[model samples]
Target: ASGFIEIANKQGLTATLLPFGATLAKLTFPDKNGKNQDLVLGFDTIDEFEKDAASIGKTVGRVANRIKNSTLHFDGKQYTMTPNNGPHYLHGGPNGLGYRKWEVVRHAPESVSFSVRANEQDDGLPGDAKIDVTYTVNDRNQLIIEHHATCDTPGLLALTNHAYWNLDGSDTVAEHFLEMEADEFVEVDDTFCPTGAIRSVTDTGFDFRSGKQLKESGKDAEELLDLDNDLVITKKTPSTYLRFWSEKSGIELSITTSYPVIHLYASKFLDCKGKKGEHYKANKALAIEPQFHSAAPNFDHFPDVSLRPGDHYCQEIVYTFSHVN
Candidate 1:
């Protein structure tokens, strides 16, 4: 009781954070199943994520996503990163904050503020920076996440939370009706890294403006799986939020953000092997993400990701859920 920390609460919702990684542990919400499920997603216990990782419900930062060859060159300097995502640097690194322990500053009933001191080692992958994440769930069934950071040396740093959302509690989200306000998406090279080009989704299966069933999008039976790429919100505004609804399930989901871009990832992978090969059921869910730049650290022509000690970098995202007619 001397120096233990918890989280803050407001209404009927409760927030839990793993100080080990500043990752979200639980986000309780009522589902159509007449049950309150941890819709934000994570392992059943901290021990489960500790032993096994898909970056489950973790705060992916210090350069989220992939960099070519686990290395990047900025301002004529080359940096080699930890290669975990096959031949590329995926989700920072296998040992980044998504896996490291965090320090709990304050915790209450409906909110939690967590920090991680990612020293020089963590910075090597993208940039030298210490990041903080705070989560608040108010009385309106809204989940808010705020990210702030201070960089020791400028190179590149991008952050995002990997939360798979399923409003209907179904095994697969292929039946849900989806619509996006984006006209184009970042085209990738063979390595699965964005080619710094925003191509139209018009003729491609990436288009979602008119709304379509997930099965009709030709993603349900793909080799690697669901929508795991970035989507550019061309119609984004102060009130813009990508939306998805389930007519049969009576659930509607929306996202609002100030970030210039948003990425969508719908997964259906079955690679949930834990320590002893005890596999867990991988659910197919969608993610509406808010981020600044698209893999800037390694990409030669992408936007600048330089952050300094005196710079005030901030990002905000909110997911609001409601019942559909």
Candidate 2:
């Protein structure tokens, strides 16, 4: 329950998981040269990951992202919530899903499972539920994260695994090229909470409609240095996917999820002594979070994350790794 769980596929891909937050300790895949490289950022040990302030490779939930004014408004009732990120409720509070402990439900050579129990009194979220997460790897070079929840009370719930990726195992992701499927994103004020305005990505730094290189050596370098917004996914394509790749290692990560939005966080405030004494600074990695929205509970027009009684809430995210060659 407190140690590490590693799963591997036949395609030279492996995943390490922690029961703490059901965290993804590491995801390693073979590069173009057949050398396996750690694609996700993590710590040297489980204790280091537990002390991580950045959330690192973990399951963030109950409700991921912020809830404005430390309040939850849903179904004609308003609930006062705990505040962790200044005045706003962030990632379900200081003891959020990612910051606490979980139990290892089961494990196999290619898959591992973990679960967390949340009480209404503990999180003030109107639910006594168990959120179970499974990390599975396949021969197709895919790391699939599956989540299922059964709540005792009808309430709001939005969850996402907050994992930062560095495809090339480099110091910065400046040379990574990205392809975004959405042209609109959620607008946040100074508090980093949704302002309820879904803005366009055109003529701005958010534009990735025509595939973009994250290289920030030119005029827009400063602008593209930081991105912590939730991109509004328009619709699914024949195969719904978003991607980012590092030319240095020829490593590509394609994201496919059941969630409607993706939080593209270019590690701007990354101040951590990372794995193996690596000093991780700003722009070191990218945390692409798939969820409902940043602060979806505050908006009536947006999709709600309500879970009906006796009903199961489920979602999945498939992260595939392949070398461009």
> Which candidate number would show the highest lDDT if scored against the true structure?
2
What would the per-residue lDDT of candidate 2 be over residues 1-325, giving only the tens digit for each residue?
3788899998789999988988999988878887889998989988899889898988998889998999876678888986788899888887788887888888899999898888777677766678899999998888999989988778878999999999988888977899878989999997778998999988877788777876542365355476789998778458555988988889999888999999988898899988888999888999989999888888877787888788888999999888776
* Model 1 Cα lDDT, one tens digit per residue, 1-325: 1222234334345556676666766665555654555555556555776765666667886777777678778667778866787788887787777777777776767677877866546546545777788888776877788988887776566788876666665666667777777787877776677777878889878888888766565544443335667777776337645777776566677777767667776665545643233343544566555775566775556656667767967888887766665
Judged by whole-model lDDT over C-alpha atoms, candidate 2 comes out at: 0.86
TM-score of each: 0.87, 0.95
Task: Judge candidate 1 at residue 8 and give its lDDT.
Answer: 36
lDDT of 2 at 151: 81
Off by over 4 Å in 2: 216-224, 236-238
lDDT of model 1, residue 143: 76
Best by TM-score: 2
- Pull out the clashing pairs in model 2: none
lDDT of each: 0.68, 0.86
